[PDB]
Design a protein around this ligand. Structure first.
Ligand SMILES: CCCCCCCCCCCCCCCCCC(=O)OC[C@H](COP(=O)([O-])OCC(O)COP(=O)([O-])OC[C@@H](COC(=O)CCCCCCCCCCCCCCCCC)OC(=O)CCCCCCCCCCCCCCCCC)OC(=O)CCCCCCCCCCCCCCCCC
Ligand SMILES: CCCCCCCCCCCCCCCCCC(=O)OC[C@H](COP(=O)([O-])OCC[N+](C)(C)C)OC(=O)CCCCCCCCCCCCCCCCC
Ligand SMILES: NC(=O)C1=CN([C@@H]2O[C@H](COP(=O)(O)OP(=O)(O)OC[C@H]3O[C@@H](n4cnc5c(N)ncnc54)[C@H](OP(=O)(O)O)[C@@H]3O)[C@@H](O)[C@H]2O)C=CC1
Ligand SMILES: CCCCCCCCCCCCCC(=O)SCCNC(=O)CCNC(=O)[C@@H](O)C(C)(C)COP(=O)(O)O
Ligand code: SF4
Ligand code: SF4
Ligand code: SF4
Ligand code: SF4
Ligand code: SF4
Ligand SMILES: [K+]
Ligand SMILES: [Zn+2]
Lengths: 103, 314, 145, 154, 157, 97, 208, 126, 48, 96, 178, 114
């Protein structure tokens, strides 16, 4: 019953995202981050936007910043629901999975 | 030639080989390997079918997008045959049964359907027609199916004088009715061999070899109006073949019919005057090399993880 | 330049010309830089193009209905910075970002002008000159183009 | 405006799956608190940066003005040019720290884009966390590590 | 027509009704599209109400929902799992990745569509297509396997 | 919202929470699907004067990084990359769960 | 003041310049360059021989305490002799700072792995080897982590094609998933999205 | 003790992983790209480029798209120097054709030449 | 669309069609461009 | 309008039709080749010429922001109506 | 600031009543009974299941569904073959070929969008300067073959003519935001 | 013309590492064929290994030989613990690919590829 060694083999979802991004433009490479973490879409968008905005030495308007923070926290709620409910589903409980997926 | 039939590319999946082939028996055992080779080099394969779309569904992965055209047809619908062969330069005929139904019999399947297909192909003006008969189906054979295939050969040569006729031997493969048949004799008490199988001599031929020969006959300018004999490199007795298959398995739609056992006990003729796989550019791989992938599914767990049968000249 | 406009008035519009089947003229886009006029005066040597009028109404072209066809007449399509003088065979065909550029040599005459073949999706779409100071400078003949 | 909003940070004390689950739930609650603050303090104003060389203009401005049409054309064909340089921008992702290392060569395409995943390091550390444990235990460790594989593999 | 063909047609109706009323999938789920799959499993759309059972083993599966990006490292696993599934099996590809490669079509390690590996019955377009649209694809699959006439083909053999 | 009082009391007692006050099914309190047309405001650069782009070109103010020391070009107290981080204060709202 | 321009604080620039001088004078044996960007990010470029001492000093120093490795990556610039630029981003939680350490390598000179210093460097250096072919000395288990099994070539290199060299498909004749030389139904259309006019005069290189 | 001698040409073709067809049969071009004469800017004529020889692009039977069979069709590499491109090409084992940087010749531009007393440079219009 | 009907246009379909997949009236793709390279036509009369 | 070839196949508005001996019409065997019935060239030919009173007219295609970018057409040629490059509407100056 | 999720203040001692409470909790399954009770409460709520296909999930006019090519009210195609949609298309799913029409208009001869390559991101409909290409609200267009998702200009124009009564209304509802 | 060695000072112990790697591959080929149920025989698998080695045999740079040995050890270890599957092993033989003959007449008859 012991776990003596654990070796996770990955790359089963390797997509060459960085090579495609460096072969595309910045706006064209923006929706790649939506599919990098397909639960934290606005958060990846926000991180990429902050990186490009830093490199461009520009800042978004305050309303855009407030909207980005609001949907970042909505996305945090989405992702924490995803994590907690899938953890409970793997342990064996699925009614919170259904409830929080209605949410 | 037309501008859309000029070959292009390196012969891959997305290339164009310039082959527009209507394959009639594509839903069978040899037909899947033929369609696999055609779509592998990249060709416009028209599949007329009469069974279910679920039954033909395994053919869909087997070519590029739009390179395979599936269409329903009926053997009594010469209009459907004409609509299948209307836009093609090669028509390949693989229609056959090992038994007789109440709707189609041996004479109909081996004569009337190939004659109608070749007549429609001649009316549509296709450049090449290939018809697959069977070896030692010469004439006046003991079984009805071989005589029917002989009459069908005569009718196909009458209506389409330059038809390439290919006579392979008993074809073995993963989904064949030869090696799986001999493996399924073990489910009974013993092995029912007539004269203990000593009088019958057979040289089985691999299904991939037959399909490569068919494709090279489509692409070969010298194969027009010829009859080929597609046979394996080694001749085995029936008893030695049964010994080899049972020792390779390590153990120790009707299942069988009178025509089937008659064709089993009919010996294979010597191919002397006919050209063959080496003349169409295919090296005949042996059953010893290509037998493990077939008989592995009949083994047990202890035997999941054998001397060849000896070869005669006659 | 700036990233926005303060022009709240109505823009002017100029009727087009028909100087030939090679150069399509949409003269509303013209910014009156006299590059075509100077090229036709100095290199083509025809003295056919010019400015008629005064002020904002000053129009580049020919005053009469005259067909401007000499050799070396696609170079006005080259040197027009705006899309006022475009190529009529190349009209509405491709885009510069999608066209691939292949540096080759012209064989229409024995000058051997260095050219770029602009090919999109495996089809030859355009012919442009290459800068070679010892052969053809910046220009190619009309037959070449 | 995370410096402008106020919230609490859930801190565990035992370092196990239970503490991580409690931290994630209290992060949900603090996220709801920040959502309340954002709803109450949403300001008026424009929606993109007022710079048509980076953000595209409005469609009416694009269909009316020459500069707006030109900038819309260039932004939606070539895109804005980013000045050359390298940055590493890391934000607090829900799954951890999301990092982007951008190297720009001065053109309208990024020269290099390395994506740093928290799940990559977490699943690298899966073997340490699974010492002296069970099958259901390593399943629970995978569940509490918040592992997604698109971000891990890229 | 003959009375026997009417009985054969009614038997086809019964068998097709059983197969479309009891449609147990395993979702070979990879990505974004698998997340949207479990949003279709979610209480709003209720494929369990439709008769479609969530989280079935490949040994008990009828249709494979290819949900996500099929990579070169994953394609042999996809083919092996498809081969382990019993013979009355269908394939619903979902999303642009499983359809034709999608946003990673020109990638070195992405199979350009799962139809290069397994025979796809129905393609569901989107990135991700909504759970509403995936349930549309499932009902289209039920109609398609309602259209099957296997005993009719066997009788006309 | 259509539940009877008996079922509502049973649900409230069985869950321990007031459920009818916070229903997870939206009935009428949500916004209308048809909205009046908006009028979005304009940004700070929407002015007809004193709006030269060189005075607000943040993209062109990026400079190459300053070389502190180079191997080809180039008693004091020890320093840190930043002052040490201030300890976080405990929450005055709810410090413990 | 300007709503479209990112605000600039010079205290971070001064602090990072002071710390760059600090690290440069502490380790003159390995540190080749120190720069602070306009984004207030400190980059220290070192010799490949000093990767272990530099990382150990940054992790274990009292003033540094860069105990968290943000990431480990490589950049392929195939115009210089040592074409792979290995970049270590590190985070100091004690001082709330971030640092970047750069070094160089080519296809035939491996650099020392820092698994003994940071444990995430195991998988990160596995990724760097799999994507670029930069070997790492004294690694516990250096092998592929993202590519296909038996994948030939390192795909994140600049000279590696975007679509690759082989593609997988199911062959029914062999009943397998087989690799073919790659053929595209539609070729990837490259776009020349570069303006012929110079954008940033601050980065104008001198003529050759 | 930790420094050896190697007297070869730095061949890494066995480690690049490229198939031997796309090493031996390919030709590469090293060149400064010509200025697009439809514009006047010269920012695209600063960096050396290596490209590959054009291979076959045929027509898809289904959609008419441009289908290709070689992977090195969109491969363009940027270099700061001709010698750097030479080193990269010889290191990767590709046979190269190099053409030197075509620089524009300096020209004597005089605005007063347009209004000459006796020379032919006097213009007839403006 | 009874109190607020849509704007009437002459090119709008007067008969809605459902999903016609796996029907004779399904959609079949083709290249909408004409022939690009024109082959030389040999003369129909012999030289001798 | 939609016309048919001697092969019986409908000709698209781009002028595309398959040849008699072209094999690529087997994709239309047992199916249909759909051609959009409304031809834009015919529909814009049916439009009457707008008779305006100005030497320079402005067109946005109607609807303001719902149309095309606003352009100006110079109606100086009295032997030819001025055509919008976006919407194809024709304008004529009223000189009476 | 920060807060503790599992730390508890000081000690609550070890009292006989507290020990009896814990023993009763882990001998009579009190938390198990209360979990059963609130799962019973959800048994007695109303399900959140809509009646597909007779009931549809709510959407917005911004919804990015099936692609379509629109027209002017005159009937002329809105598309002017300007190729920005395929220039901005991040998946390179749009292929455009163009030539002057018989009346000299700038129109496309080929406008193909691959649904199997498209990522449904709306970049084409937000880069289109004349509102020609749109992502209309159709999403129930799943096909049984891979070919049927390879759209061409005729299919896109047919979709635009079919969905014009809804696409134009959605653009009217939302165009002031964009 | 002086560089830093990776593992081997010169070609001698590099060839020793090559011999050790070839020895271990020759050991593992029958176990590979038996365990992963390969259609091939033991003889032609060893021939495949040998002609892979002869394909790489033309290089004499010690660093390149060391890196080739390292990559061969990775491939071998990947075969030892079975992650590389039957399809990945059978990718070495190209039995589903029609080969291109190298004669000028055949390359002329196929297409424009040199
Ligand atoms: C014993 C209780 C049986 C169930 C019952 O009476 O529930 C009603 C009702 C359910 O409460 P609820 O959750 O508030 O009702 C949901 C809506 O408020 C009200 O629901 P609605 O407005 O959506 O529509 C309700 C309507 C729905 O009408 C139908 O479903 C008619 C179906 C006709 C089919 C022909 O009528 C009923 O449900 C009446 C009760 C039918 C019970 C049938 C039991 C036998 C079924 C067949 C067995 C064979 O019960 C009570 O309020 C008290 C239950 C305990 C009584 C003792
Ligand atoms: C059996 C019970 C089935 C479910 C009954 C309704 C559940 C909800 C009850 C209300 C609730 O939530 O209370 C919270 C409370 C739990 O509150 P708590 O979790 O805060 O803990 C109580 C407080 N301390 C910490 C001090 C212990 O539930 C109870 O108090 C009930 C405790 C269990 C009582 C029954 C024990 C024996 C059960 C098995 C024997 C058979 C019984 C008869 C069966 C007949 C039918 C087969
Ligand atoms: N199989 C062998 O070992 C050998 C075979 N041959 C010959 O090669 C050919 C192909 O062999 P094989 O694949 O094994 O044969 P099959 O038994 O598999 O049948 C071949 C094809 O014929 C079709 N067919 C059968 N009867 C009819 C009919 N009445 N009308 C229309 N189509 C029909 C079947 O379609 P459906 O699924 O709809 O029934 C099937 O696709 C045959 O002509 C056979 O005689 C020769 C030597 C050896
Ligand atoms: C089952 C099938 C699976 C196939 C797996 C194939 C594994 C391939 C491993 C490859 C390992 C290598 O490439 S290391 C070999 C390269 N080494 C060299 O070139 C060193 C120099 N070579 C030589 O000197 C060669 O002549 C020899 C023959 C290797 C040495 O003999 P000399 O003495 O005359
Ligand atoms: S070159 Fe072009 S822009 Fe310049 S004056 Fe001539 S037409 Fe006008
Ligand atoms: S592309 Fe240039 S020339 Fe053409 S309309 Fe725009 S600004 Fe004028
Ligand atoms: S099709 Fe789109 S949503 Fe689905 S897996 Fe691919 S990237 Fe994700
Ligand atoms: S929505 Fe689809 S077609 Fe449009 S730009 Fe995005 S990926 Fe391309
Ligand atoms: S952006 Fe619009 S008008 Fe331009 S080519 Fe695309 S669909 Fe046509
Ligand atoms: K011009
Ligand atoms: Zn207009």
């Amino acid at each position: 019953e012991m776990v003596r060694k654990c070796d996770p083999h990955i790359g089963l979802l390797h997509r060459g995202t960085e090579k495609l991004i460096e072969y595309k433009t910045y706006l064209q490479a923006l929706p790649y981050f939506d599919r990098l973490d397909y639960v934290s879409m606005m958060c990846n968008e926000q991180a990429y936007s902050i990186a490009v905005e830093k490199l461009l030495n520009i800042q978004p308007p305050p309303r855009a910043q407030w909207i980005r923070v609001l949907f970042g926290e909505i996305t945090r709620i989405l992702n924490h629901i995803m994590a907690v409910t899938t953890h409970a589903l793997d342990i064996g409980a699925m009614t919170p999975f259904f409830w929080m997926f209605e949410e | 030639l037309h501008h859309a039939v000029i070959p292009h590319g390196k012969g891959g999946r997305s290339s164009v080989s310039g082959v527009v082939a209507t394959v009639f028996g594509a839903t069978g055992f040899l037909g899947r390997y033929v369609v696999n080779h055609l779509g592998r080099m990249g060709s416009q394969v028209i599949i007329p079918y009469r069974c279910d779309v679920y039954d033909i569904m395994h053919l869909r992965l087997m070519g590029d997008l739009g390179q395979l055209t599936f269409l329903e047809w009926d053997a009594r619908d010469k209009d459907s045959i004409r609509k299948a062969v209307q836009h093609s330069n090669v028509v390949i005929n693989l229609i056959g049964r090992e038994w007789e139904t109440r709707n189609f019999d041996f004479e109909d399947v081996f004569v009337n359907i190939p004659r109608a297909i070749a007549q429609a192909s001649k009316e549509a003006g296709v450049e090449r027609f290939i018809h697959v008969s069977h070896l030692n189906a010469s004439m006046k054979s003991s079984s009805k199916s071989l005589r029917s295939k002989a009459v069908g050969e005569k009718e196909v040569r009458s209506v389409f004088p330059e038809a390439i006729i290919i006579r392979p031997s008993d074809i073995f493969g993963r989904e064949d009715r030869f090696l799986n048949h001999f493996a399924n004799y073990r489910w009974f008490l013993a092995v029912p061999l007539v004269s203990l199988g000593f009088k019958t001599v057979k040289q089985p031929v691999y299904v991939a070899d037959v399909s490569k020969g068919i494709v090279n006959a489509t692409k070969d300018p010298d194969a027009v109006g010829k009859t080929f004999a597609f046979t394996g490199p080694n001749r085995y007795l029936l008893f030695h073949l049964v010994k080899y298959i049972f020792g390779m398995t390590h153990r120790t739609e009707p299942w069988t019919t009178k025509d089937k056992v008659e064709r089993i006990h009919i010996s294979d003729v010597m191919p002397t005057d006919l050209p063959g796989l080496e003349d169409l550019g295919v090296q005949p791989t042996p059953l010893e090399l290509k037998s493990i992938e077939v008989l592995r599914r009949h083994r047990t767990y202890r035997w999941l993880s054998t001397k060849p049968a000896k070869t005669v000249n006659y | 330049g700036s990233d926005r406009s303060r022009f709240l008035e109505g823009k002017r519009a100029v009727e087009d010309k028909n100087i030939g089947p090679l150069v399509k003229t949409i003269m509303t886009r013209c910014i009156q830089c006299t590059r075509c006029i100077r090229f036709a005066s100095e290199i083509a040597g025809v003295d056919d193009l010019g400015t008629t009028g005064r002020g904002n109404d000053m129009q580049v072209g020919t005053y009469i209905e005259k067909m401007f066809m000499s050799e070396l007449s696609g170079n006005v399509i080259d040197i027009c910075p705006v899309g006022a003088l475009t190529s009529k065979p190349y009209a509405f065909t491709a885009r510069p970002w999608e066209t691939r550029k292949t540096e080759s040599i012209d064989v229409m005459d024995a000058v051997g002008s260095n050219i770029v073949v602009s090919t999109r999706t495996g089809e030859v779409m355009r012919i442009l000159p290459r800068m070679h100071e010892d052969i053809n400078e910046e220009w190619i003949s009309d037959k070449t183009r | 405006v995370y410096d402008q909003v106020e919230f609490d940070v859930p801190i565990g004390s035992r370092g196990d799956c239970y503490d991580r689950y409690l931290c994630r739930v209290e992060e949900m609650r603090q996220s709801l608190r920040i959502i309340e603050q954002c709803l109450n303090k949403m300001p008026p104003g424009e929606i993109k940066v007022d710079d048509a060389k980076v953000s595209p203009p409005k469609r009416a401005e694009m269909k009316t003005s020459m500069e707006s049409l030109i900038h819309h054309f260039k932004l939606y064909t070539e895109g804005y040019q980013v000045p050359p340089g390298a940055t590493y921008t890391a934000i607090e992702a829900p799954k951890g720290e999301f990092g982007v290392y951008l190297v720009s060569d001065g053109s309208s395409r990024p020269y290099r884009c390395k994506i740093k995943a928290p799940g990559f390091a977490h699943l690298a550390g899966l073997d340490k966390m699974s010492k002296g444990h069970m099958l259901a235990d390593v399943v629970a460790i995978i569940g509490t590590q918040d592992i997604v594989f698109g971000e891990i593999d890229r | 027509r003959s009375r026997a063909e009417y009985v054969v047609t009614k038997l086809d109706d019964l068998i097709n009704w059983a197969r479309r009323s009891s449609l147990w999938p395993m979702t070979f789920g990879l990505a974004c599209c698998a997340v949207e799959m479990m949003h279709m499993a979610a209480p709003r759309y209720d494929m369990d109400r439709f008769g479609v059972v969530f989280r079935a083993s490949p040994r008990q599966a009828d249709v494979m929902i290819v949900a996500g990006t099929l990579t070169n490292k994953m394609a042999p696993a996809l083919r092996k799992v498809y081969d382990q599934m019993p013979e009355p099996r269908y394939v619903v590809s979902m999303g642009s990745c499983a359809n034709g490669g999608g946003y990673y079509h020109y990638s070195y390690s992405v199979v350009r569509g799962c139809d290069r590996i397994v025979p796809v019955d129905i393609y569901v377009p989107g990135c991700p297509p909504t759970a509403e649209a995936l349930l549309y694809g499932i009902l289209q699959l039920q109609r398609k396997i309602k259209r099957e006439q296997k005993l009719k083909i066997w009788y006309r053999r | 919202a259509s539940a009877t009082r008996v079922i509502q009391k049973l649900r409230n007692w069985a869950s321990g929470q007031d459920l009818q006050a916070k229903l997870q099914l939206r009935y009428q309190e949500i916004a209308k699907r048809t909205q009046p047309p908006p009028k979005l405001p304009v940004g700070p650069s929407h002015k007809l004067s004193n709006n030269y782009y060189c005075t607000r070109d943040g993209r062109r103010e990026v400079v190459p990084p300053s070389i502190i020391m180079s191997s080809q070009k180039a008693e004091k107290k020890a320093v840190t990359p930043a002052p040490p981080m201030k300890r976080w204060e405990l929450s005055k709202d709810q410090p413990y769960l | 003041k300007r709503p479209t321009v990112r605000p600039r604080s010079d205290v971070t620039h001064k602090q990072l310049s002071a710390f760059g001088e600090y690290v440069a004078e502490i380790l003159p044996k390995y540190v080749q360059q120190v720069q602070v960007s306009c984004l207030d990010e400190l980059e220290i470029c070192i010799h490949p021989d000093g990767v272990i001492p530099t990382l150990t000093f940054l992790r274990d120093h009292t003033n540094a305490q860069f105990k968290s490795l943000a990431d480990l990556t490589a950049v392929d610039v195939p115009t210089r002799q040592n074409r792979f630029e290995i970049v270590y981003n590190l985070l100091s939680l004690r001082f709330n700072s971030r640092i970047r350490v750069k070094t160089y390598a080519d296809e035939l000179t491996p650099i020392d792995s820092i698994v003994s210093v940071h444990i995430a460097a195991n998988w990160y250096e596995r990724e760097v080897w799999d994507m670029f072919g930069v070997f790492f000395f004294n690694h516990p288990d250096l092998r592929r982590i993202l590519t296909d099994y038996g994948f030939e070539g390192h795909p994140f290199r600049k000279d590696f094609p975007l679509t690759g060299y082989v593609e997988l498909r199911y062959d029914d004749e062999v009943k397998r998933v087989v690799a073919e030389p790659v053929e595209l139904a539609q070729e990837f259309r490259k776009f020349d999205l570069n303006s012929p006019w110079e954008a940033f005069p601050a980065y104008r290189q001198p003529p050759e | 003790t930790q420094l050896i001698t190697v007297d070869e040409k730095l061949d890494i073709t066995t480690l690049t992983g490229v198939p031997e067809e796309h090493i031996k049969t390919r030709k590469v071009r090293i060149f400064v790209p010509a200025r697009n004469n439809m514009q006047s800017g010269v920012n695209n004529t600063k960096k050396w480029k290596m490209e590959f020889d054009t291979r076959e692009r045929w027509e898809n039977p289904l959609m008419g798209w441009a289908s290709t069979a070689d992977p090195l069709s969109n491969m363009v590499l940027t270099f700061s120097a001709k010698e750097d491109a030479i080193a990269f090409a010889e290191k990767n084992g590709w046979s190269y054709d190099v053409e030197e940087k075509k620089v524009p010749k300096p020209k004597s531009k005089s605005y007063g030449a347009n209004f000459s007393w006796n020379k032919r440079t006097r213009v007839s219009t403006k | 669309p009874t109190t607020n009907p849509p704007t009437a246009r002459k090119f709008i379909w007067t008969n809605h069609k459902f999903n016609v997949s796996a029907t004779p009236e399904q959609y079949v793709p083709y290249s909408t461009t004409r022939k690009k390279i024109h082959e030389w036509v040999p003369p129909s009369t012999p030289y001798k | 309008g939609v016309q048919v070839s001697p092969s019986g196949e409908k000709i698209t508005h781009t002028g595309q039709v398959y040849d008699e001996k072209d094999y690529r019409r087997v994709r239309f065997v047992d199916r249909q080749k759909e051609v959009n019935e409304n031809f834009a060239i015919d529909l814009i030919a049916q439009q009457p010429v707008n008779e305006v009173e100005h030497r320079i007219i402005a067109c946005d295609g109607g609807g303001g922001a719902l149309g095309h970018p606003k352009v100006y057409i110079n109606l100086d040629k009295e032997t030819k109506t001025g055509t919008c490059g976006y919407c194809g509407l024709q304008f004529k100056q009223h000189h009476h | 600031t920060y807060k503790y999720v599992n730390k508890k203040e000081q000690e609550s001692e070890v009292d006989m009543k507290s020990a009896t409470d814990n023993a009763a909790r882990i001998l009579m399954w009190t938390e198990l009974i209360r979990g059963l009770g609130m799962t019973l409460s959800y048994l007695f709520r109303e399900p959140a299941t809509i009646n597909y296909p007779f009931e549809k999930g709510p959407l917005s006019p911004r919804f990015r569904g099936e692609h379509a090519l629109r027209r002017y009210p005159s009937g002329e195609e809105r598309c002017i073959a300007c190729k920005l949609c395929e220039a901005i298309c991040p998946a390179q799913a749009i292929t455009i070929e163009a030539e002057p029409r018989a009346d000299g208009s700038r129109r496309t001869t080929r406008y193909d969008i691959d649904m199997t390559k498209c990522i449904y991101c709306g970049f084409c409909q937000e880069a289109c300067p004349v509102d020609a290409i749109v992502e209309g609200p159709n999403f129930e267009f799943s096909t049984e073959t891979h070919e049927e998702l390879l759209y061409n200009k005729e299919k896109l124009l047919n979709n635009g003519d079919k969905w014009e009564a809804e696409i134009a209304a959605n653009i009217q509802a939302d165009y002031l935001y964009r | 013309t002086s560089v830093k060695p990776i593992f081997s000072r010169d070609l001698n112990e590099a060839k020793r590492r090559v011999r050790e790697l070839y020895r271990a591959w020759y050991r593992e080929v029958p176990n590979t064929v038996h365990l992963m149920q390969l259609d091939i025989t033991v003889k032609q698998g060893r021939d495949k290994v040998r002609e892979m080695f002869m394909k790489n045999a033309h290089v004499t740079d010690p660093r390149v030989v060391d890196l080739l040995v390292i990559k061969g050890k990775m491939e071998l270890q990947e075969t030892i613990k079975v992650w590389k599957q039957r399809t990945h092993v059978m990718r070495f033989f190209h039995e589903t690919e029609t080969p291109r003959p190298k004669d000028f007449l055949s390359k002329f008859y196929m297409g424009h590829d040199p």
